[PDB]
Amino acid sequence: LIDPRAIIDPSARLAADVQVGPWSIVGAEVEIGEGTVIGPHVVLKGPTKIGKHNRIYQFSSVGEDTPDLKYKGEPTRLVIGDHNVIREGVTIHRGTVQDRAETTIGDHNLIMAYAHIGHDSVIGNHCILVNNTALAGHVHVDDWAILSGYTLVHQYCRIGAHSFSGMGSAIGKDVPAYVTVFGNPAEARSMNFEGMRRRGFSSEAIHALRRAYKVVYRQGHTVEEALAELAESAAQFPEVAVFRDSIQSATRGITR
Amino acid sequence: SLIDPRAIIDPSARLAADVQVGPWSIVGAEVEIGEGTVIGPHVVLKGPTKIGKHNRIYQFSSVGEDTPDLKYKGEPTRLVIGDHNVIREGVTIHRGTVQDRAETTIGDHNLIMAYAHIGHDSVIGNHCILVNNTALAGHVHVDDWAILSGYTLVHQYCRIGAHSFSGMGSAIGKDVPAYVTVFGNPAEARSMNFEGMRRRGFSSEAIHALRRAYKVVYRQGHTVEEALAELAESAAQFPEVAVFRDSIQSATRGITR
Amino acid sequence: SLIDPRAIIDPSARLAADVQVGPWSIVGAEVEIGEGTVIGPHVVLKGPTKIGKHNRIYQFSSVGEDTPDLKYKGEPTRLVIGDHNVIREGVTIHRGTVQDRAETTIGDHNLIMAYAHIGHDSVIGNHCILVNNTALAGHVHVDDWAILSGYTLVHQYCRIGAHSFSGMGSAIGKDVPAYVTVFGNPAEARSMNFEGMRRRGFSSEAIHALRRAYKVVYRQGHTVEEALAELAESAAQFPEVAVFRDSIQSATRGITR
Numbered sequence: 001l002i003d004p005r006a007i008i009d010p011s012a013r014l015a016a017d018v019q020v021g022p023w024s025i026v027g028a029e030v031e032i033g034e035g036t037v038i039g040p041h042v043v044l045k046g047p048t049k050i051g052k053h054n055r056i057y058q059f060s061s062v063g064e065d066t067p068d069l070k071y072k073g074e075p076t077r078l079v080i081g082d083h084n085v086i087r088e089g090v091t092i093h094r095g096t097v098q099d100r101a102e103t104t105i106g107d108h109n110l111i112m113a114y115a116h117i118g119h120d121s122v123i124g125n126h127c128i129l130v131n132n133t134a135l136a137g138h139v140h141v142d143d144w145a146i147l148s149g150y151t152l153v154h155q156y157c158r159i160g161a162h163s164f165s166g167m168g169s170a171i172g173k174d175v176p177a178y179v180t181v182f183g184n185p186a187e188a189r190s191m192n193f194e195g196m197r198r199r200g201f202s203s204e205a206i207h208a209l210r211r212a213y214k215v216v217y218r219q220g221h222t223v224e225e226a227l228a229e230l231a232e233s234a235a236q237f238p239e240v241a242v243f244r245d246s247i248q249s250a251t252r253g254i255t256r
Numbered sequence: 257s258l259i260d261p262r263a264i265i266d267p268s269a270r271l272a273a274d275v276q277v278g279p280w281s282i283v284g285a286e287v288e289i290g291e292g293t294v295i296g297p298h299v300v301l302k303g304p305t306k307i308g309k310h311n312r313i314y315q316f317s318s319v320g321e322d323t324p325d326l327k328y329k330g331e332p333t334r335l336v337i338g339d340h341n342v343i344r345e346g347v348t349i350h351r352g353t354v355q356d357r358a359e360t361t362i363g364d365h366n367l368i369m370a371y372a373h374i375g376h377d378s379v380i381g382n383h384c385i386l387v388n389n390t391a392l393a394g395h396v397h398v399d400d401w402a403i404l405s406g407y408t409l410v411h412q413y414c415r416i417g418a419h420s421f422s423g424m425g426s427a428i429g430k431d432v433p434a435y436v437t438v439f440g441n442p443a444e445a446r447s448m449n450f451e452g453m454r455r456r457g458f459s460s461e462a463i464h465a466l467r468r469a470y471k472v473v474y475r476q477g478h479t480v481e482e483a484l485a486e487l488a489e490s491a492a493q494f495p496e497v498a499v500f501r502d503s504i505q506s507a508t509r510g511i512t513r
Numbered sequence: 514s515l516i517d518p519r520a521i522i523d524p525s526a527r528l529a530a531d532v533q534v535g536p537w538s539i540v541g542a543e544v545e546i547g548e549g550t551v552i553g554p555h556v557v558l559k560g561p562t563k564i565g566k567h568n569r570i571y572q573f574s575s576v577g578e579d580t581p582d583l584k585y586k587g588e589p590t591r592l593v594i595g596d597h598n599v600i601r602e603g604v605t606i607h608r609g610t611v612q613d614r615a616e617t618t619i620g621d622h623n624l625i626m627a628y629a630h631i632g633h634d635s636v637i638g639n640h641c642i643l644v645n646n647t648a649l650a651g652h653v654h655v656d657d658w659a660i661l662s663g664y665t666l667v668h669q670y671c672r673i674g675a676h677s678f679s680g681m682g683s684a685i686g687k688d689v690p691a692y693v694t695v696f697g698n699p700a701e702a703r704s705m706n707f708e709g710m711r712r713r714g715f716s717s718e719a720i721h722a723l724r725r726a727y728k729v730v731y732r733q734g735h736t737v738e739e740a741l742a743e744l745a746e747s748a749a750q751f752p753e754v755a756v757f758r759d760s761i762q763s764a765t766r767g768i769t770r
């Protein structure tokens with residue numbers, strides 16, 4: 001289960017059915033939960049906590065220090081939840097003290113080859129980061145979001161739930177929930193109706209979100225004006241409230 | 257032949273004469289390696305996979321992994337690499353899926369540069385160059401002598417024409433006709449690869465005929481049906497123009513404009 | 514001790530006494546490593562290659578490989594890295610070609626972040642930052658304090674000026690003058706790096722001269738001939754406008770506009 005060619009630090013805690021492949025390093029203060037398979041040629045650094053039924057593939061560096069010139073060796077953390085797939089050559093950096101000292105990943109996330117998750121980023125659940133997606137730092141990715149290949153995200157951006165970025169997008173402003181963005185710089189194109197159908201949203205909820213999109217994007221309304229007008233629809237449909245909350249929380253401005 | 261003793265060779269693996277495997281490489285079950293093939297250190301080969309003769313695979317490459325795109329993998333799906341290919345550092349090459357071809361296929365004399373990605377069910381021909389960080393999403397067909405420049409991204413189901421050229425950072429969502437130069441995200445057709453035609457020793461008359469073939473398709477407001485009819489005489493006279501005409505006729509889902 | 518027993522050190526390797534080499538790393542023939550330098554695990558160092566003092570090279574880096582460029586034919590070419598450099602996860606640095614000066618050179622205090630690529634015959638200065646996935650095609654000159662943000666792509670023979678800044682996803686095909694800010698694919702000149710200069714301790718007067726300098730080249734309709742003339746005067750009063758004027762003089766590919 002633990003390959004003999006692997007290096008397991010004395011201070012690392014592993015669960016019973018944890019598999020570690022050859023030429024992998026499990027460093028000091030790395031906990032790894034039940035059902036988790038660490039491939040060959042993985043480097044894990046701590047303090048890091050990994051959940052259960054996770055798969056980390058070869059040439060991944062999970063829990064390295066950020067090279068960000070404001071980090072200075074503080075004992076910052078990385079937390080990964082359950083049922084995640086981290087593919088080949090992914091880099092995940094621990095938090096910085098300037099902002100909560102923790103990088104967090106939720107459950108059922110799929111982080112494809114050579115993706116980069118920067119210091120202090122927060123991923124939710126059921127997210128897909130396609131190959132070479134890069135989160136600069138302090139990026140919040142809400143549940144069910146899809147960032148397509150080579151999507152670049154500037155520090156401090158919020159990517160809303162069920163949002164979609166096109167391949168090679170460069171995001172500089174918050175992406176609201178359900179919104180589709182494309183290009184460098186990314187600009188909003190529509191709502192992720194496909195994404196909503198893929199979760200059996202009530203058709204009334206899809207029609208409600210289509211209306212909400214128009215209130216914000218296609219009616220010359222200011223953000224305050226749009227939020228005001230979304231109030232009733234929000235209180236009526238919890239689906240619309242996610243959208244409403246994602247704009248309200250974006251006082252860095254929204255991706256247009 | 258030199259098999260590094262720090263390598264892991266699965267007992268079901270088959271190595272031909274003069275195969276080298278560097279330290280800390282894995283040749284997994286049902287991997288066949290052809291004569292004179294050099295596997296570097298830190299390579300992961302997974303099967304079922306057939307690699308031909310006189311290949312070179314560099315460190316940190318993962319060759320014959322399963323696509324992450326399916327949660328519940330099907331087997332058997334295959335990867336076939338031919339002869340005299342160079343696969344540089346960190347390249348990822350996924351096997352096929354049961355849904356579709358069940359096989360990812362690379363021909364001969366290809367150069368796949370560092371951190372390139374070849375997705376499931378893709379088909380590469382001969383004498384192609386995929387520059388660093390080129391990414392084929394899946395079901396991509398790259399025909400002979402095509403050059404994808406650095407950080408080219410190709411949507412699933414796209415055909416990249418023979419002797420075509422994509423500029424660095426291009427994102428291709430439609431078929432690229434043979435010989436055409438494309439640039440941008442999203443990719444736009446700019447001109448023809450006249451440089452490659454000359455480098456490959458095409459005649460000035462074939463080059464001139466292809467310069468006119470481009471104008472017929474792109475600059476005269478013809479339906480593709482009408483462009484194809486306008487090219488039929490040129491295509492009959494020049495096999496190089498028939499390759500162009502064929503790549504346009506085979507593009508049911510439209511060409512990069 | 515300091516050399517991990519699981520590392521491979523070639524007999525013809527010269528390591529200073531306090532040099533750390535982590536497990537499953539290779540130090541190839543004719544690799545020289547200077548005092549203080551820490552080599553991580555799973556690193557491949559190939560020669561002939563000189564690494565200076567107090568360097569740090571992270572896992573999955575390939576430092577000193579041959580270029581795949583078809584114009585290299587196995588000649589004895591080198592790589593030189595200076596002191597106090599940080600090379601992160603998965604970086605690729607290729608050695609020179611005989612067609613230039615047979616050397617790839619890196620200076621001191623450089624930060625080269627994950628999966629960056631430094632191609633054959635590139636020369637990096639001092640205090641540069643190459644963010645994740647930056648790619649220099651080859652013969653690229655990056656001057657001191659340049660920052661290339663993530664996924665910056667640089668065409669061969671391009672010069673990146675001192676104190677310049679390239680935005681995420683930039684694709685540079687023409688020289689970037691010193692102090693200039695560029696964004697986009699293709700790259701576009703979008704003023705000068707005033708924030709970097711102010712923080713670097715440049716004088717109010719130098720910044721003001723540079724603003725007029727920028728107008729001379731970019732906003733007055735002058736040619737490079739014309740504009741270089743017009744800078745002479747200011748180039749005398751300030752070193753900075755000299756560095757700027759020099760960057761425009763040496764621009765063999767034209768300048769980013």
Ligand SMILES: CC1(C)CN([C@]2(C(=O)Nc3nnn[nH]3)CN(C(=O)c3cccc(C(F)(F)F)c3)c3ccccc32)C(=O)O1
Nearest residue numbers: 130131146148149150166167375391392393409410411412
């Ligand atoms: C089946 C499908 C419709 C899905 N798809 C995928 C795609 O990138 N579509 C797209 N993005 N931006 N504009 N279009 C690729 N895909 C992928 O995950 C994929 C895998 C490797 C490389 C890449 C690339 F080229 F972008 F670097 C992508 C995926 C993942 C989630 C959602 C959609 C798509 C695609 O290309 O065809």
Ligand SMILES: CC1(C)CN([C@]2(C(=O)Nc3nnn[nH]3)CN(C(=O)c3cccc(C(F)(F)F)c3)c3ccccc32)C(=O)O1
Nearest residue numbers: 110126128146163164192193194195196198324325326327
């Ligand atoms: C290709 C696939 C069968 C799988 N898939 C994807 C998915 O998120 N499935 C899922 N939903 N809920 N739980 N799992 C999203 N996806 C996709 O590739 C995808 C394709 C077209 C359009 C879109 C959308 F909604 F964003 F416009 C996405 C992908 C890529 C890799 C792995 C899994 C999946 C999907 O929707 O169809």
Ligand SMILES: CC1(C)CN([C@]2(C(=O)Nc3nnn[nH]3)CN(C(=O)c3cccc(C(F)(F)F)c3)c3ccccc32)C(=O)O1
Nearest residue numbers: 387388403405406407423424632648649650666667668669
């Ligand atoms: C000598 C040459 C004329 C060729 N060339 C190369 C190039 O990228 N040209 C180009 N791309 N997009 N637009 N033009 C790079 N090159 C390369 O192989 C190369 C290597 C590393 C990184 C990159 C980059 F920058 F694109 F990420 C490229 C190559 C390979 C085949 C054909 C042409 C070119 C180049 O830059 O100068």
Ligand SMILES: CC1(C)CN([C@]2(C(=O)Nc3nnn[nH]3)CN(C(=O)c3cccc(C(F)(F)F)c3)c3ccccc32)C(=O)O1
Nearest residue numbers: 118134135136152153154155644645660662663664680681
């Ligand atoms: C703190 C900061 C203002 C700086 N910054 C950084 C950035 O790339 N800014 C930027 N690029 N183009 N337009 N803006 C990211 N950053 C980084 O080094 C960084 C780290 C990981 C990934 C990336 C990405 F996604 F672009 F690949 C970048 C850095 C390094 C030096 C200077 C500025 C910035 C950023 O996003 O927030």
